[PDB]
Design a protein around this ligand. Sequence first.
Ligand code: AMO
Ligand code: AMO
Lengths: 501, 502
Amino acid sequence: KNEATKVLEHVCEDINKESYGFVKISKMKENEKEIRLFNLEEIYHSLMHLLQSDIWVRGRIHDIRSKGSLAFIILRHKLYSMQCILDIKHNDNDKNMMKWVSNLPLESIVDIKGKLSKPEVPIDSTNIKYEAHIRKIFCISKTAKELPFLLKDANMKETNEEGSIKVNQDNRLNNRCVDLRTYANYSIFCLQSQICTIFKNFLLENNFIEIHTPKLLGESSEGGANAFQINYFNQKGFLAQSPQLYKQMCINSGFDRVFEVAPVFRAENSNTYRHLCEYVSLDVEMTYKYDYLENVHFYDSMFKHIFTELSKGGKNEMLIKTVKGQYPCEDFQWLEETPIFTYEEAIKMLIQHGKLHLKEEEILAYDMSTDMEKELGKIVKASHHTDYYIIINFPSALRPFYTMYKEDEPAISNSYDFFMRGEEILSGSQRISDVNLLLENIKRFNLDANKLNFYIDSFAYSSYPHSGCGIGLERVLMLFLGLNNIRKTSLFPRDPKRLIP
Amino acid sequence: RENLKNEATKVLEHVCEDINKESYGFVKISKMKENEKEIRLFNLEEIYHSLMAHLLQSDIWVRGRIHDIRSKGSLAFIILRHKLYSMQCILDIKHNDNDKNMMKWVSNLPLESIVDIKGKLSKPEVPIDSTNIKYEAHIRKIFCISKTAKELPFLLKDANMKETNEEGSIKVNQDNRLNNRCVDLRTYANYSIFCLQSQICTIFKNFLLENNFIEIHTPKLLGESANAFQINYFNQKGFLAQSPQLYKQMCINSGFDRVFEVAPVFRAENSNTYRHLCEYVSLDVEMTYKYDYLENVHFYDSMFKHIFTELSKGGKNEMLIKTVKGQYPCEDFQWLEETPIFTYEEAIKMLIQHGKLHLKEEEILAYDMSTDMEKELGKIVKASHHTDYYIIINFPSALRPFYTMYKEDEPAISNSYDFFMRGEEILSGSQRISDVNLLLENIKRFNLDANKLNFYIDSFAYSSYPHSGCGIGLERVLMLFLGLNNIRKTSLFPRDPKRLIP
Ligand SMILES: Nc1ncnc2c1ncn2[C@@H]1O[C@H](COP(=O)(O)OC(=O)[C@@H](N)CC(=O)O)[C@@H](O)[C@H]1O
Ligand SMILES: Nc1ncnc2c1ncn2[C@@H]1O[C@H](COP(=O)(O)OC(=O)[C@@H](N)CC(=O)O)[C@@H](O)[C@H]1O
């Protein structure tokens, strides 16, 4: 009784003299710890002369099987799986070792000493088509709690059967540290990192500098009602909904081309599949020579570049494929030359396809809904065969006060949205860069010029012609992959009903 | 009788209607078409790079801000400015059809206005020492596309001057500069400072990516933490993150192995000092280690050494640093091929042996260094090791956060570290507790509420890799690299207990 459970909980005191057991990191000094420890990613990349001799590898026990003399371990690290096997082939039939190993809880972290070789038929699961024969296995971190759900279940595509295996969004978000271990979730957030990298490097290559502007404000920035309020040492303040005012102030200071990658905070009480209370905004602001279209074409080049880099062979292709295995969706498509529609044209397309009913004099007054966004996206996919397009010339009355209107037709503005799979990823405009026109537009929008005093003032000592845009990082990733919910592309999502974890 | 002024006023306000037939005036951008075609417009950075081409054979167009105008009778001298670059442009009316109205209009342009100039570049006998473009433009046309509307709060000539005690030296004080930040940021030194800030972010990110890190973004709206700003989050009590600590650890417990984040954090402590802000940009790293946390420590070290090396090489960074030093002189930042590392005990003994610190032996383990004492240790180490950069490890466990792993041999000491630049702290970090039972025990030891940290504690319950991390102040690193006297110089729009604006 005590006998067997003593070996099930066996702690190793000398890794040389023994071949299995729980071990503190302190004790891992076989021949004075000249251990060359490998991880699955390194192994994958070199094999797909590590394999001429025994090696040490660390990983999580993704799955365990045990029958008689044989025992299979699926060892996992990030995206990489490998089958390791304990058959007591060269272990002197310890048998107690078999009991110890076969009782290890899933997700436990293990250091295996073993020999690589390629099997006749590898497992279809392990993307490492080699296997390891276990000469020694030590557990440096034992799973302490039963998982909230099994990874095999959370990794599986949803069949939607009556008695089907399905892990709820709530369950996953509540237990995010486990949810993130699925192959698709790991890949999703590697791709999020990739988008940030391509974005920054493109702008840096085009002579931009990165800026960091405050999120604690004295005023609203993108509107008062939807801002979170704070007590700032007995001043009333707000969280930034956007770095809009500061990135323009930086252009007014001469920085010429700036970007920011930073959180913003939105306090709208909206609970939708695409709305967050906190998200990462990629912001750009820059000057133009004579026409604001110069900048629009530039923003377009940027996104085409992002798509080109995300769709390339190598790592990104494996990441996207791993996402698509659980969440299938056709490849994101874009044309060599991006289609650009005017808002009027887009609305007339919706009318022509009988999705909207509007007389002429009402078109510029209609404010396009998210449903109509997706309907326009379907129309353009069928006619232009792309998932990516631009709408310009939004009605002035539907855009913020800093948007420059067309002087010859003030009912429309020099403004633009970009769309992926029919849904908005980017919003931006030519800015009003004349301080008097700016004050006129502020009063036309019934805003309080005193609360905007420092921003306005930044235009009083001249102002370059400039434009800019703001982009949702989580939206871009969501829509590139076709995912159903933006909570899949934010690490720890924030929404009106979720502050935790 | 004297209505002639009315005419003069018409001249000073002249709006140009056709740039093909006129040589000066205010213009709409929509009217800058030369013979119905598009102007090839240059900026001063392009000119600087080319000349220091097609620029010397014919008239060109250049845009810039009027940094200065000097009127001298039939000549006027305009200094045009863009970024770090300036160029002298000359209007001589003998060459401009003896048109006195044009001269009158040019002289009356306010500083900082934005103009497009059409003219011919040539190299003068001896160039103006203030302009780093050593060519001059001789003006054939000049059009103003944005006129300064308001008297400046202070003059840029004064805001650019190095501070001295010489007679009639005008200083622009901090309160004034910060209040009119969009003007202050136009000084050459301030422009250069924030280019160097961007440079630090780029080098940090690129180093970590080349070493197989991924960038993460973790929430700043939190549910639970008294140095935190509070928020009402839809009838919940929320707080602003002081640090992404818990989430970057949670990511390591999720398998991400190597993560960094560049993001704001928010600190509500009521402290007004030269080096403390209420909002700043934190550079955070968190990563696993094989068997010894010192692996990661040496990695963080090479990261900073790499940053220093990249900041100190090449034309661009060299000119940015030289431009800062022209206004704010300071010895070049110094470091060693082997970074010195001291234990906390060692550092304390050094301070005591040098007469800078007196303590009872009993109080040696509880002592917490002041910032003045930080600078004193910095002076000692500068004199003995000839470096501005060094590391302290092995702080007492009682002085470090609850997630800090202590030495199991001697639990009073922890596996923690700070890095120092010019004697002042830039980085804080440690080996983490990665055993969930030890974590619960330490949380109990610090009289913390486990319920408030549940989601975090739970993330250690399904195994935890051995790991460590660090947090870095971006503005502090830049300030101490340049030797600047105040962190408000290295934060674009500073936040402190008495400054919410701009
Ligand atoms: N609640 C939200 N949750 C998640 N993502 C969101 C959310 N709201 C917006 N986005 C993303 O940010 C982009 C720009 O935001 P806007 O509010 O349209 O514009 C702005 O904030 C202007 N300052 C832009 C500019 O003119 O520079 C959107 O296209 C979308 O991808
Ligand atoms: N008020 C401030 N204003 C400007 N910069 C500041 C301010 N406070 C700190 N810093 C910078 O951040 C680094 C680490 O922050 P700490 O609070 O020491 O540690 C932390 O935040 C831990 N979570 C780090 C970790 O262990 O990961 C400092 O060295 C300094 O450069």
